A paper describes a structure:
Nicotinic acid phosphoribosyltransferase (EC 2.4.2.11) (NaPRTase) is the rate-limiting enzyme in the three-step Preiss–Handler pathway for the biosynthesis of NAD. The enzyme catalyzes the conversion of nicotinic acid (Na) and 5-phosphoribosyl-1-pyrophosphate (PRPP) to nicotinic acid mononucleotide (NaMN) and pyrophosphate (PPi). Our structural data allow the assignment of human NaPRTase to the type II phosphoribosyltransferase subfamily and reveal that the enzyme consists of two domains and functions as a dimer with the active site located at the interface of the monomers.
Here, we report the crystal structure of human NaPRTase that was solved by molecular replacement at a resolution of 2.9 Å in its ligand-free form. The crystal asymmetric unit contains a dimer of hNaPRTase and a total of 98 solvent molecules. Human NaPRTase monomer folds into 17 α-helices, 24 β-strands and the connecting loops organized in two domains: a first domain characterized by an irregular α/β barrel and a second open-faced sandwich domain. The irregular α/β barrel domain (residues 160–378) contains a six-stranded α/β core (β6, β7, β11, β12, β13, and α6, α11, α12, α13, α14) that identifies hNaPRTase as a member of the type II Phosphoribosyltransferases (PRTases) subfamily. The crystal structure of hNaPRTase reveals the presence of an intimately associated dimer in the asymmetric unit with 3000 Å2 of the surface area buried at the dimer interface. The two monomers are arranged head to tail with the N-terminal domain in one monomer contacting the α/β barrel in the other monomer. As already reported in the previously characterized NaPRTases, the active site consists of a pocket located at the dimer interface. In particular, in hNaPRTase it is delimited by the loops connecting α-helix 6 with β-strand 6 and α-helix 8 with β-strand 8 of α/β barrel domain of monomer A and completed by residues of β-strand 11 and α-helix 1 from monomer B. In hNaPRTase the corresponding region (β13 and β14) revealed a different orientation determined by a 10 residues deletion that shorten the preceding alpha helix (α14). The resulting structural arrangement sterically prevents the binding of FK866 to hNaPRTase due to severe clashes between the inhibitor and the protein region defining the tunnel.
Numbering used by the authors:
A (entry chain B): 16 to 378, 390 to 407, 415 to 534
B (entry chain A): 16 to 378, 390 to 408, 416 to 533
Write the structure that this text describes.
C-alpha cells in the first residue's frame, strides 16, 4: 500500500533530487469542529501500527511501477522501494481515548523524507475514520447517558470487504457496550450480542417439520417435550388470556420461534414485529416462552423495530402485573425489551429516560498531514513551523482549559504559571497558572521498534469515558459549544514572527 | 491532631528558636519489603485531605498543653497553635494505587517547619495503614487470580472507629470484589455483600413462631402460603432422595433458614456447617430452596467455613446436580458456593481454582518521615538530601526497570539515554535508554488549596490492577523477588558527595 501514481512520482521526484533520505518531521492534525462538536476523540493508532509492520511491496507491485514510469529511471534504484523502510521512523501519538481539539497534532511522524511522505494517505484513512466513529459513538452515549448494557451497535452492513470490524471496534471505544460484529469480537473481544433477523421469520410458511421436534429437559434425563405440540397447547391459554382467535397468530412466526427455541432454549429471544405485535408476535412469544420454562427453560428477551417504541415497550411489560399472575411465572416481566431501527435521536433520549421500559437499544474532520521541519530547519507556508511539544493545561476542577504548543527544545510543565500568546488575542500574552500540565503526544515508535505495548480497548475505552466526564459542559454541548484555545509558547510565537507570521 | 508530648515539646523548641515559620520540605517514604514482596500500593491520599480540615481547633487541647508545663511559657503564644491551618502547606503525591518501592518518596510536604513537622504523625498513620491493606489485597488477588465474583472482605476485626471503613476501602482498591462494611458502601460506594452468621442459626430451638409464616407468591397478588409447612413437605422428599432419616436434619437450623427466607425470599442463602453439612445443613437448604421456588423464588447462595472446602464444594455440586434433575429445578446447579475461614494464603491457592467449584471467598512497612530541606538549604544526616523529583523508567513491554531520582531543579528525562549512578553504586554509572519515563509524584495541594480532584476508587482500583499487570514477573514474585533498583542523577549524586 503504495496505491496512487502521485505517491510514486513524488517519491521518484525526491529520489532524483537527493532528498529521499532527508530527515523530515510531519504532523497530522485537523481543523473542522467535527459534527459541530468541539472535540474529536482519538482513534486510529491500533491500525496504524499493524500497517507499519506490513509495508507490503511485492516485487511484482514494483515491476509494475517501472512500466508506468520513465524507462531507464535511476539506475534502476527501484531497489530503494524494495528495501523499505526498515524502519528509521519515529512516532509520537495521542493515546487512543484522548480528546483532540483542532490545530493540535495527534501524530507527529519523523524519518527519511521519502518514506514518511508515503504515509500521508494511509494515516489519514485510518485516523480520520476511526476518530469519526468514536466521536459519534461518544455523542450518542451523551444523549443516552449511562445505565445498564443499553447500547448495541450494529445490525447493519459493512463499508467494504471486511471493515465492519472498525465501526464495531471504535463504537465500543466511544461508549457502546456490545456489538453484533464477530470480527471485532474475535480479534478485540468487543462483547458480541444481537441475534435476531426478519429473514428467518419470513422463510417459514407454516409447514413445520420434525426431523426432531423434541427439546431436551433443562436438567437431565432422556425424553423431553415435543416442543411444537406443547406451544400450541400454551397458545390456547394465551389467546384466552388475551381475547384472541387461536387462528390469528401467524403459524410461520410460531414455527420460527420454536425453531429458534430448539437451538437456543436458554437464550430464547422473540422478534415481535414481523407481522403484528399485538395479534401475532406477542401471543406466539408467550405460547413459546411458556412451553419453555417447564422444559429448557426461562426465555430471555424480545425485540421491536417499528411504531412508537416507547409506547410498546411500556405496554409490553404491562399487564404482567397479571400476564404472569395469570400463569404464575416469576421471571416473565424481567425479560429484556430490545428496540431498534427508527430510533435516532429522541426517541434515543426518552427511551434512555424516564422510567422507560426499554433495556437495550440497537444503534468530516479536516485532517491534514503537513511537513513542519526538514533537515531540522522549520517550514511554514496558518500552520505552525518546526517540531513541537504539546500540553493540556487543566483547571483546579480536573477539566481542560487550553492546549499549549511549544518547541521541542523548551523546558516543560509544571503547576506554576506562564506567559502565553493566545492566537486570536495575539497582541499581548496571558499569564496563566494551570493546576496540572499533562503532555499529550507520547512516544509510540522509535527507529521502527515499538517503544510501548498496546492498550486493550478496555483501557483505551476507560480513558475516553474518563476524559469526557472531566470535560467542561460548555465543550461537551452537541451544537454550538464554547471554543477551546490552542495557544503558543513565547519562543514559538517568536519563531512564528521570525517566519513572517 | 497532636497526640504525644514531645511533638508539642519540639514544636515549642522550634518556636523559641525562631524557626517555626522556616520553610521546610519533608519526605515520607518506606524502607521494608512488606510480606516479603518487592512493592507496596500507594494509598491513603483520600483521608489525609479530608482530615486537613478535621484538625480542627479545639482550644481545650491547647489548654491541657500549657501544662506542657513551662508556665513560664512564651508570651502566651499558644495562639499560633489555635491559629494553625495547614495552608502554606504544599503536597505532592504518588496517586493512589500506583506501585511504590522502598527508596522513593510517596509524598513531599513543604511549608512552615513547625507546621509540616507536626503532620509527621497523622500522615504516617494514614498512609502506612492504607498502603499496607491495599498491598495485602493485591498479594491475595494475585494468588486468587482474577475472576468475576470471587473475593470478599472479611470482617470480624479491623480497628474500632475508622478502620472497618479504611480496611474495606483499600481492599477494594487492591482488588477485592466487595466488602461487608456498610460505612464504606455509603460514602465511597463499595459493593456490599455477605450476610450470614453462625449465631443466627444457633439461636433457634426449633420451637418456631408463626407470627407471620406467610410468604407471598412472587407472581403477583394472591394469598401468601405458610413456608414452614412446605419446607416440611419437601424435607421428606430430599431425605428420601439423599438416604437420611427425616429426623436427623436439625429442626432449629430449619427454623433459622425459613426465617431468613421469609426476610430474603429473592436472595436466600444457606449456612451449611453449624451442625453436619451432609446430614443437616444441606438437606435443610434443599428443603427450603425447593419450597421457596415452588413459589417462583430462587436460592442464591450456600456457605461453608469448616472442613476441606475444596472437597466439600465438589461433592456439594454433585448433589446440586443430582437434585436439579431429580426435582426438576435447574437453577440449583448454578447456586453459588461461598467459602470462608482460611485467612491463610496457601489455602487460597487450592481454592482458587484448579477447577475448584467455589465461587466466592471470604477474606508492617518500614515507614519514615524525614526532613530533606530547610531554608532551601539541604539536610542529609548520613537518607538523601534536597528537594527532589522522581521518575519511573519503563518499558517497552510496559514493565518498569527502575525508579530514578533527581534534583527538583533538573530537566525532565524522555526516551533517549541517561547516565546514572546507582546505590551500591558509587563505583560507576549505568547507561540506560528508557522506552518511557513516567514522573511519579504529582501536585495534589498547593498553599492550602487543592490543585486537582480526587480520583475515584474505580479509577484508582483500575490503575492498581493495571500497574500490577505491567510489572515484570521477578518483582511480582511473592517469595524472594528481585530488588528494584533506585538510582540517582549525576547532579543528585554530586550533592550526596559532600560530605559523604
Amino acid at each position: 500500500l503504495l496505491t496512487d501514481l502521485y505517491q510514486a512520482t513524488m517519491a521518484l521526484g525526491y529520489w532524483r533530487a537527493g532528498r529521499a533520505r532527508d530527515a523530515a518531521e510531519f504532523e497530522l492534525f485537523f481543523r473542522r469542529c467535527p459534527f459541530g462538536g468541539a472535540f474529536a476523540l482519538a482513534a486510529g493508532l491500533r491500525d496504524c501500527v499493524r500497517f507499519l509492520r506490513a509495508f507490503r511491496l511485492r516485487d511484482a507491485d514494483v515491476q509494475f511501477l517501472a512500466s508506468v514510469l520513465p524507462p531507464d529511471t535511476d539506475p534502476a534504484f527501484f531497489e530503494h522501494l524494495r528495501a523499505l523502510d526498515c524502519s528509521e521512523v519515529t512516532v509520537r501519538a495521542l493515546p487512543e481515548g484522548s480528546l483532540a481539539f483542532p490545530g493540535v497534532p495527534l501524530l507527529q511522524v519523523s524519518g527519511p523524507l521519502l518514506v514518511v511522505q508515503l504515509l500521508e494517505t494511509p494515516l489519514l484513512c485510518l485516523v480520520s475514520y476511526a476518530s469519526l466513529v468514536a466521536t459519534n459513538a461518544a455523542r450518542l452515549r451523551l444523549i443516552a447517558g449511562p445505565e445498564k448494557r443499553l447500547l448495541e451497535m450494529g445490525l447493519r452492513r459493512a463499508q467494504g470487504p471486511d471493515g465492519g470490524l472498525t465501526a464495531s471496534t471504535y463504537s465500543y471505544l466511544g461508549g457502546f457496550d456490545s456489538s453484533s460484529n464477530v470480527l471485532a469480537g474475535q480479534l478485540r473481544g468487543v462483547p458480541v450480542a444481537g441475534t435476531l433477523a426478519h429473514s428467518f421469520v419470513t422463510s417459514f410458511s407454516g409447514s413445520e417439520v420434525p426431523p426432531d421436534p423434541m427439546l431436551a429437559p433443562a436438567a437431565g434425563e432422556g425424553p423431553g417435550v415435543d416442543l411444537a405440540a406443547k406451544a400450541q397447547v400454551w397458545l390456547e391459554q394465551v389467546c384466552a388470556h388475551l381475547g384472541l382467535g387461536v387462528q390469528e397468530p401467524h403459524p410461520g412466526e410460531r414455527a420460527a420461534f420454536v425453531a429458534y427455541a430448539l437451538a437456543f432454549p436458554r437464550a430464547f429471544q422473540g422478534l415481535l414485529d414481523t407481522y403484528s405485535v399485538w395479534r401475532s408476535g406477542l401471543p406466539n412469544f408467550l405460547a413459546v416462552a411458556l412451553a419453555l420454562g417447564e422444559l429448557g427453560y426461562r426465555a430471555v428477551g424480545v425485540r421491536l423495530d417499528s411504531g412508537d417504541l416507547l409506547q410498546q415497550a411500556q405496554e409490553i411489560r404491562k399487564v404482567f402485573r397479571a400476564a404472569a399472575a395469570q400463569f404464575q411465572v416469576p421471571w416473565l416481566e424481567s425479560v429484556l425489551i430490545v428496540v431498534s431501527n427508527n430510533i435516532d435521536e429522541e426517541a434515543l433520549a426518552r427511551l434512555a429516560q424516564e422510567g422507560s421500559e426499554v433495556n437495550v437499544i440497537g444503534i468530516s474532520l479536516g485532517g491534514v498531514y503537513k511537513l513542519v521541519a526538514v533537515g531540522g530547519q522549520p517550514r511554514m507556508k496558518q500552520t505552525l513551523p518546526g517540531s513541537k511539544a504539546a500540553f493540556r493545561l487543566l483547571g483546579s476542577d480536573g477539566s481542560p482549559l487550553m492546549d499549549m504548543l511549544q518547541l521541542a527544545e523548551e523546558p516543560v510543565p509544571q503547576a506554576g504559571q506562564e506567559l502565553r500568546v493566545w492566537p486570536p488575542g495575539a497582541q499581548e500574552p496571558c499569564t496563566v497558572r494551570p493546576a496540572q500540565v499533562e503532555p499529550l503526544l507520547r512516544l509510540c515508535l522509535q527507529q521502527g521498534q515499538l517503544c510501548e505495548p498496546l492498550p486493550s480497548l478496555a483501557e483505551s475505552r476507560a480513558l475516553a469515558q474518563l476524559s469526557l466526564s472531566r470535560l467542561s459542559p460548555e465543550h461537551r454541548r452537541l451544537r454550538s459549544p464554547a471554543q477551546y484555545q490552542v495557544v503558543l509558547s513565547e519562543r514559538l510565537q517568536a519563531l512564528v514572527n521570525s517566519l513572517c507570521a
